[PDB]
Design an enzyme around this catalytic site. Structure first.
Site, mmCIF file in Angstrom:
data_model
loop_
_atom_site.group_PDB
_atom_site.id
_atom_site.type_symbol
_atom_site.label_atom_id
_atom_site.label_comp_id
_atom_site.label_asym_id
_atom_site.label_seq_id
_atom_site.Cartn_x
_atom_site.Cartn_y
_atom_site.Cartn_z
ATOM 1 N N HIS A 10 0.797 -1.189 -0.029
ATOM 2 C CA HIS A 10 0.015 0.134 0.035
ATOM 3 C C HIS A 10 0.890 1.425 0.080
ATOM 4 C CE1 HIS A 10 -2.053 -3.355 2.075
ATOM 5 N NE2 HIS A 10 -3.114 -3.036 1.317
ATOM 6 N N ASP A 23 -12.622 -9.505 -2.048
ATOM 7 C CA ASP A 23 -11.545 -9.218 -0.746
ATOM 8 C C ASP A 23 -12.645 -8.237 -0.387
ATOM 9 O OD1 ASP A 23 -9.660 -7.952 0.852
ATOM 10 O OD2 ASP A 23 -8.640 -9.500 -0.067
ATOM 11 N N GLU A 47 -13.650 -12.980 1.142
ATOM 12 C CA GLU A 47 -12.289 -12.948 1.991
ATOM 13 C C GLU A 47 -12.367 -11.740 3.044
ATOM 14 O OE1 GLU A 47 -8.706 -13.388 -0.005
ATOM 15 O OE2 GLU A 47 -7.652 -12.011 1.256
ATOM 16 N N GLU A 54 -4.941 -12.889 6.950
ATOM 17 C CA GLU A 54 -3.802 -12.062 6.212
ATOM 18 C C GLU A 54 -3.307 -11.345 7.403
ATOM 19 O OE1 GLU A 54 -5.773 -10.771 2.959
ATOM 20 O OE2 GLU A 54 -5.028 -8.605 3.509
ATOM 21 N N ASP A 85 0.171 -14.182 5.769
ATOM 22 C CA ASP A 85 1.337 -13.649 4.998
ATOM 23 C C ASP A 85 2.424 -14.055 5.601
ATOM 24 O OD1 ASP A 85 3.439 -11.513 4.566
ATOM 25 O OD2 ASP A 85 1.862 -10.945 2.974
ATOM 26 N N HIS A 137 -1.246 -15.266 1.757
ATOM 27 C CA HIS A 137 -1.416 -13.861 1.003
ATOM 28 C C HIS A 137 -0.213 -13.714 0.105
ATOM 29 C CE1 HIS A 137 -0.560 -9.494 1.111
ATOM 30 N NE2 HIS A 137 -1.840 -9.437 1.316
HETATM 31 MG MG LIG Z 1 -7.114 -9.981 1.503
#
Ligand SMILES: [Mg+2]
Ligand SMILES: [Mg+2]
Ligand SMILES: [Mg+2]
Ligand SMILES: [Mg+2]
Lengths: 395, 395, 395, 395
Positions: B23, B215, B241, B269, B292, B319
């Site tokens: 991000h 998601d 998700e 995640e 993740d 993830h």
């Molecule tokens: Mg996700």
């Protein structure tokens, strides 16, 4: 990158007399001296476990030769029927594969034998092949197996001794002594009294702190086990092992609930796979799981069984498997101490656990084993040339 | 046996602009285009996740230099505050240790930070160090990480693509397309209709078989998620998700129970450690766990999380974490397909997931990745010289 | 009272080519034609089950000679490794015993092999011996086995047929047709569509009433099985069999809960003992348990498994075992219909289930079998002289 | 094969004075000396169970004549009302049937009386017919019933004695002594003190190992039973029997939980069918189930009840039923010891349990019974010609 060799051939041999098969013994051994078992209810099969056939299999030796000349091997319990499975069935999944395809090979072995496996002999066989594969991988990488398993988490292993002489074990430096139960339910109150007398005698000799445990080899029923545990409270028994048959998950959960506060209930040497141990842990059947690396599915599967126990914050103390257990437990936070089976007939001296099959096999010194002793590639042992090998099958 | 080097020094650096911190983007990117989040109930923070600070940390780069000159490294999300933790706290457990002491180092990092860790930033930090350790071990062994993790169980990885253009992902060979939900509960029925309209449009473009997923980035409530899933059944949505915040284990279990038969509920995640995932699995919170590797505890802990999932016969689709996830998932029977984040601003072409930080980073070729491509030591990537590193702390 | 003979000797033989080991076939048989299995995820082992070794054991033949000259026998799956167990281990519990000591002999066989048994091959072996014992007792009593098991509760058996041609089975008078699933999870949506297309085709040919079922041979995962069952509802599928591996008790319970209302979930052919089936029943894993008498522990143990099912008011439709299942199911209120495997290569005609090993083996006549046909002593069959027996071991 | 005869006629007779109906006694018997019962709360019905009608039924005799001249029979509790049921209702399902149709006949008897049966008198009646059928089958085959039930698993039976003189029972060789509780809840603390005094006196006489048990004949409430059990701990009470009424499943489960660790809770003599016992076992109501073969449904149903207990690894110790229990328990692994009711008025000598109705009835010798004594066909007994039979009905 390093050129990874492929597997050229897999071979299975049979060996008899001591070694991997703990019970493949001769006369005069404590390990066959009136041990309580599920067959004890029959007087004719009460004095000797060999009488009901505990020694019918012998040792399975698995060798895996790689394209680079390296040869890995392992020993476990299985003998000829296991050799059949290795040669005629499992070999196809290994030959031609890269030595690093551990997870894939295990999966193919398990899924291809599912129709006649799941537990027992078939899993013992898979475990043997798996151990030989890890031995081979260690040899190819020129590193001891513990370094392939995330590295040791302690500088040395500390052992408790299993045998009829916990008093002699204390004098040898062991941290505790697990004694075999000699009387089962069919011997009634007289047998229970004798069981507690044996524990009382050993407690007097070793003092109030030395660990004492009872191994019941699946021979009791819920009520008897409950009463034995309660009666052993007086002598500070640390744990009661394999009180019931492995399929009685419900009974184990009840026993653990009815057990004296602080006393542990252990089991698992006759349980196999991540699913068998998931059932034990989820149903609250025991405080310590005791898989045998050579019977539960091998190192590959034990890694998964161990992780499951980690999530359950449960202790894992494998059923003594010589170097196969030493290399594994050294790397586990959940395995603070290990089992050392006293294979000396009178349990009055330390001898290699898998004697006489393994050359280079380390043994506890004053009850401990420095990780520095496990510095050779693979599991660090070699097959003793004096042991006459037999190859019943080819493929 | 091989001479194992020790760790000379650990260093933490900070990098900004794309990379591991997905991000940490600029303007005009689909990944910041009105994504539904827990902050969406506030109009001021609804259009951009960056507005509420999803990009405040940036990337943490961890380097670990060994006595033999080898240097392992990894990238994850954490930035300066994570670098502080690495340099001032964690370094002490690594420096001087043998590179193979992975399990011991992890345990010390986790147990020493428990008082301010357990989840979140501290675990991200531990994960980054752990990843750098595995990269280093791979470089010392001169083998790709997948060979250190039991070996690949598949000849290639197959990916589903995450982004606002599942239709374009289909044309690029991906097996499915997971799209971001753009409207949350505060947007009411109009928003729900818009969400379903977007799904309908994509389903029309890709046909009835292509996998489509939503998601929701922790942005819904139980009833809204229940209604969204029911409304999406008409379009054959494969899974929904992270419908709810990570702490709502109870809500997830209820959602999974009320979900359309056959449709899956996934999450994870934003969950960490074997214990966090044990709660998700035991409470029946989801059909697929999505840890993740750079946030859940690293490879060492993900191995345990994965084993737990194995016992639960659950799917594990980590993830997407570029090479850090590729090397791991290749070796897992429970991870049949993988996630690939479309980091191109308009998700209209394939670009390296962790661009521009990793040189040598492999991209999916027509939605797949042959394992033969992952043949270099460690995670097979190098730090891009273009990226200007910043060393905030020393020790 | 009648003079009961004792057991003089037990002998184990091995036979290859069809017979008890259903999968010990040659080329061109529907039973090896792209059957979905747990190994299907590997393209190399997807087309043929024989490729992964489903045919490595062959048939175990057990003969038990009594002091009066009578000789009972039975056939099951196990081959050479099973013969080893019979001759080297189990023989000791039978020789010298009265032919009526069935319960005691079973208990000794099970408790003496626990350390390497519980499930799989060892139980197959125990089952074969048990079957031979019942055949012998029937011959001594000069009565068909069904009369020793409480007597028939129906005048005839009605069969559903298992094979790739349920349409042809309908024309041959069978009450239903169970077809093999040919595509598993790794084959994705295309495979799922193919599975449903095959069902659709057969439903169109047989009409809306004829029973149709799917056998999945442990090859699916929970989500895929859930979706397959839902998709099959449109075609009125009666039941979905062995959707998951035997060890996944939890998955079965979930599948049964998510199955279409009215559609049944069955399993059990790869489960063994009263305890294995207790777990299936108590956890609500299935609507019908399908133990194979030659794999679950034999008639002695199946009586207990059946009684357990009675208490649970559950249906018991044993996996077809020729005369060994016919004699048993005829006496059970909980077994209203029976399974008949179509062993003809193209499942286009009726042939003896255990062909060519059993002379005198009855075949269904227009899908039924009058009990009046089972009037000979024991299981009413003799060993075909054509089949060349092999005695691998002696004792 | 053996030509199986058909049933020509079924006859029901009534007999009074001792025999099958344990409580059909005269004056001066310990079995009617202030036994605590649910009616004890009423002073007028406290001294004698006969006063409230425990002796209103008497014995039901069922005879079954076969086409070959053989005649089987059995005795149980039921008298005239039971005879009505046998003659007017059940006979139709037996006459014309082959003597081997045991399972079918039982099913028809149970399903045809369901509308007024399930438990109690009707089941007692079915049990009587069932026993007579097994007696007849044994006579037709010329073998003792234990050989039709899988054969004995022990060479002799060992008994505990039920009566007011456990001290005299010890001197007679019995392994334990079960005493009747003489005071119930309505007698308050004074009665509880008297109960414990009686146990204390017997414990002093027999020593610390001889088994002592308390039979409460459904007379207590949860709290009183809990306190009695706790107070009996001091005297090593082995088990507390039928503490509560049979319909209080919940109370039994609670009592078993509140009971002293190691002390068992038993019940079941007033429970019937596989379903009644399934409820007891599944709810964890007791450690030992004690069905009466003549009241629980007969041998056919007890086989199913026993198998259920096997799966639950529970002990089954039938409520003494003379030869009907001896032949059955001899074949069960789960029934290591048996009950012998002392029918002598002062419990100071061994007499046949069903005296004077059965000729040829064996009795324990020094507390044991060799299986060799049960060598006659059927249940090995004949109806005593001295007992005046009465046939109230015909059909
Ligand atoms: Mg996700
Ligand atoms: Mg042990
Ligand atoms: Mg099947
Ligand atoms: Mg009683």
């Amino acid at each position: 990158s390093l050129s990874i060799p492929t597997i050229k051939q897999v071979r299975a041999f049979v060996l008899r007399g001591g070694g991997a098969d703990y019970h493949d013994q001769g006369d005069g051994h404590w390990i066959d001296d009136h041990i309580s078992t599920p067959m004890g209810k029959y007087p004719e099969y009460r004095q000797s476990r060999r009488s009901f056939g505990i020694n019918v299999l012998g040792t399975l030796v698995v060798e895996i030769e790689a394209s680079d000349g390296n040869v890995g091997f392992a020993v476990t319990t299985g003998g000829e029927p296991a050799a059949y499975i290795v040669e005629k069935h499992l070999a196809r999944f290994l030959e031609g594969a890269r030595v690093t395809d551990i997870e894939r090979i295990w999966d193919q072995m398990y899924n291809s034998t599912l129709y006649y496996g799941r537990k027992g002999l078939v899993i013992n066989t898979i475990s043997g092949v798996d151990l030989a594969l890890w031995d081979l991988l260690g040899k190819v990488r020129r590193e001891p197996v513990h370094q392939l398993l995330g590295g040791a988490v302690r500088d040395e292993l500390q052992f408790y001794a299993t045998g009829a002489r916990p008093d002699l074990a204390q004098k040898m430096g062991f941290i505790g002594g697990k004694m075999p139960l000699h009387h089962g339910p069919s011997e009634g109150e007289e047998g229970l009294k004798k069981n507690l007398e044996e524990l009382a005698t050993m407690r007097e000799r070793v003092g109030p702190d030395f660990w004492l445990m009872f191994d019941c080899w699946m021979s009791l029923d819920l009520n008897y086990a409950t009463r034995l545990a309660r009666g052993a409270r007086e002598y500070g028994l640390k744990w009661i092992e394999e009180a019931l048959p492995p399929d009685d998950y419900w009974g184990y959960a009840e026993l653990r609930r009815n057990a004296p506060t602080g006393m542990m209930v252990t089991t698992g040497e006759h349980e196999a796979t991540r699913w068998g141990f998931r059932m034990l842990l989820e149903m609250g059947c025991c405080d310590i799981i005791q898989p045998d690396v050579g019977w539960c599915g091998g190192v590959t599967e034990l890694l998964k069984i161990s992780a499951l126990a980690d999530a359950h914050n449960a202790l894992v103390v494998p059923h003594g498997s010589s170097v196969y257990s030493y290399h594994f437990v050294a790397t586990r936070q959940n395995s603070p101490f290990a089992e050392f089976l006293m294979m000396a007939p009178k349990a009055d001296q330390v001898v290699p656990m898998f004697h006489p099959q393994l050359l280079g096999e380390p043994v506890p010194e004053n009850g401990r084993m420095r990780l520095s002793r496990l510095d050779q590639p693979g599991f660090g042992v070699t097959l003793n040339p004096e042991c006459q090998l037999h190859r019943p099958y080819t493929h």
